[PDB]
Design an enzyme around this catalytic site. Sequence first.
Site, PDB file in Angstrom:
ATOM      1  N   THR A  90      67.668  54.305-108.422  1.00 19.43           N
ATOM      2  CA  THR A  90      67.731  55.434-109.342  1.00 19.43           C
ATOM      3  C   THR A  90      69.037  55.446-110.125  1.00 19.43           C
ATOM      4  O   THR A  90      69.033  55.715-111.332  1.00 19.43           O
ATOM      5  CB  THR A  90      67.560  56.746-108.578  1.00 19.43           C
ATOM      6  OG1 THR A  90      66.289  56.752-107.917  1.00 19.43           O
ATOM      7  CG2 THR A  90      67.626  57.924-109.530  1.00 19.43           C
ATOM      8  N   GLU A  91      70.157  55.146-109.466  1.00 21.34           N
ATOM      9  CA  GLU A  91      71.448  55.205-110.142  1.00 21.34           C
ATOM     10  C   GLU A  91      71.643  54.045-111.111  1.00 21.34           C
ATOM     11  O   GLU A  91      72.213  54.232-112.191  1.00 21.34           O
ATOM     12  CB  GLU A  91      72.579  55.232-109.113  1.00 21.34           C
ATOM     13  CG  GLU A  91      72.635  56.506-108.285  1.00 21.34           C
ATOM     14  CD  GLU A  91      72.892  57.743-109.124  1.00 21.34           C
ATOM     15  OE1 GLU A  91      73.546  57.625-110.183  1.00 21.34           O
ATOM     16  OE2 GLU A  91      72.441  58.836-108.724  1.00 21.34           O
ATOM     17  N   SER A  92      71.183  52.843-110.756  1.00 23.32           N
ATOM     18  CA  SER A  92      71.471  51.685-111.598  1.00 23.32           C
ATOM     19  C   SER A  92      70.286  50.778-111.888  1.00 23.32           C
ATOM     20  O   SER A  92      70.424  49.899-112.743  1.00 23.32           O
ATOM     21  CB  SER A  92      72.586  50.839-110.968  1.00 23.32           C
ATOM     22  OG  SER A  92      72.859  49.693-111.755  1.00 23.32           O
ATOM     23  N   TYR A 118      66.071  65.071-109.731  1.00 24.48           N
ATOM     24  CA  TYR A 118      66.614  64.024-108.877  1.00 24.48           C
ATOM     25  C   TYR A 118      65.996  64.082-107.484  1.00 24.48           C
ATOM     26  O   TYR A 118      65.685  63.042-106.895  1.00 24.48           O
ATOM     27  CB  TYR A 118      68.135  64.148-108.815  1.00 24.48           C
ATOM     28  CG  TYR A 118      68.841  62.901-108.339  1.00 24.48           C
ATOM     29  CD1 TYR A 118      69.013  61.821-109.192  1.00 24.48           C
ATOM     30  CD2 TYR A 118      69.344  62.803-107.054  1.00 24.48           C
ATOM     31  CE1 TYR A 118      69.658  60.678-108.778  1.00 24.48           C
ATOM     32  CE2 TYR A 118      69.994  61.658-106.633  1.00 24.48           C
ATOM     33  CZ  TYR A 118      70.146  60.601-107.496  1.00 24.48           C
ATOM     34  OH  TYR A 118      70.791  59.461-107.078  1.00 24.48           O
TER      35      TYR A 118
END
Lengths: 228, 249, 208
Positions: A36-38, A138
């Site tokens: 999700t972050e990268s 999120y």
Amino acid sequence: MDKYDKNVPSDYDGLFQKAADANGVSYDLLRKVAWTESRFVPTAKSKTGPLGMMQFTKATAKALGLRVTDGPDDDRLNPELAINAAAKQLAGLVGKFDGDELKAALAYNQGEGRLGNPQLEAYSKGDFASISEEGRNYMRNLLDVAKSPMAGQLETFGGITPKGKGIPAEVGLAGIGHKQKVTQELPESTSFDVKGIEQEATAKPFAKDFWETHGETLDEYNSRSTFF
Amino acid sequence: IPDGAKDAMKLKYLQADSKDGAFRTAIGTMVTDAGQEWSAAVINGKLPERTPAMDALRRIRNADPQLIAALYPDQAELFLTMDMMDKQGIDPQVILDADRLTVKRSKEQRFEDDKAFESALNASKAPEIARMPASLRESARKIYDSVKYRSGNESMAMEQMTKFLKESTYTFTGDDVDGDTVGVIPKNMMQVNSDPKSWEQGRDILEEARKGIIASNPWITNKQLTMYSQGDSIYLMDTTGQVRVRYDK
Amino acid sequence: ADPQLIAALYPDQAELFLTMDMMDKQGIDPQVILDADRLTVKRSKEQRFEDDKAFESALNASKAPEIARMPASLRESARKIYDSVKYRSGNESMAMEQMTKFLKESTYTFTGDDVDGDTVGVIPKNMMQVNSDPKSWEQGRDILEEARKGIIASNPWITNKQLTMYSQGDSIYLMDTTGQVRVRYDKELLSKVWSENQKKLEEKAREK
């Protein structure tokens, strides 16, 4: 990028199992958070654009207790220590929320303070209306891989009818997109290479050739031949 | 196809290209690099260990001399001078010394130097020196300039040039010729063997050749032929150019 | 770092740096170069030819072999010294005497056997030193004088059995007419040869 690619051939995941076992975090949660972050993208360009797998910010990087002030302006670029720090933070968050609450620990996304404490209080009360849109989205993205007592109350939030389920933006807006028309196929140049005929070697001087073929110089030869 | 055909096609495209075309721009880097190499070598007084551009341009010249002379005359003239020095057995340091001596000298002083050199040559007693062809005179001037540059002695330079030229060249004579000289040929261009002493045989074959051509063409001006060494060939030629005969080793 | 690249790209600065290097090795301050340039710049192209002719005529009429048969590279620095002295005063005779005295006591002219004019090269004395003592310049000359005699014996085919001796930068070159025979010396190699000769001589004296 669809459905997070759970069973895709796992690229560069020789680090999540070890961090998970060291800190106690679930492997699936850590891998999903990294995706999700990268999205496992080596460039990860944004307003700040940390190319590391855990797309941190400077404030969080310094608050993590690392030696971030090193290397290329930030030390959390080598994947292993950044991933280990993220796993330790996630384990500390999960443990401190009275059990295996794997979704209140998503204070990881919002932090604790002026903008994170009231949202966590609202989550404790089960009042998802006071949680921000970013936090709600999120947490929605992690419903597939998470163990929470309120995982069923969050999915039945925002339905069209009280018996319906809310739709995450990753599903309602899924499939809508446009391809890039520019590719990394570069034009190639060619050198003007003409290999002609090799140049002849430099000759010996006539006097040197005479003195090497015959053991005497031209002057000696002329003096001796003109004696008679 | 073999590499020669590829070179021929590439040179055809280079020749058909316009002045500011892409084919001429690609090879213009070679010419710029070669010129820079030579100028830097002259300034520093020593050739560098690597001159890739000069070698590449010289090989391309060997593939097609007329095209290179048409497009890049300066490099063509430099390569011709280097070829003559190579055939005489002279290191490029001599050319570097001569260029270094000449470059530091104004246009008014160069005329005086040329006049002094020509007067010194014309006042000589050896026939090979007093009536030297211009092409040989260029190399002689370079040798003289090198010796006069590395020392301060002009008398030493003159004696070195004269001794070098006496023992490596041969002057041909004709019957009833004002000045008696009809050409000067380097001795190693008349060799019939690998033995230098064989230069005397090749001269004889030449001396009977010009006597045989004059007998076959009695209409020529004064029954006289000039003998001229160019590259690796020797030319027997009359006044009108209608009689021309080529010899080589 | 890279001399050939700078000479290829910026020839004017390269020539200026070479001139400054030669002056530095002679021990001459750049003020001399500044004075010579100041004298020359205020002068037209027609007058520069007359000045060059006058200077060359004055040099060729000298009696000292080091002055009458000076190499061109040394002649440039000599002209700069002469121009500086002739610029700061008005005396050309003083400038000539200063140049001649400076060049007599700092250079050495090599001679050959049966050479028209007798001169085969001029070398600065401090380039032939084998020690830090200036008087050692006489030793390094000897090592040089036996070198050119040894090369001529090994290569008898050269034009008149003659070599030219040329000082460039920090090296001394022994070269023939065709350039096929070229030998380089420097202060390191001269010092090494001198040390070897001293060791041989002292061991021969000790053990005999």
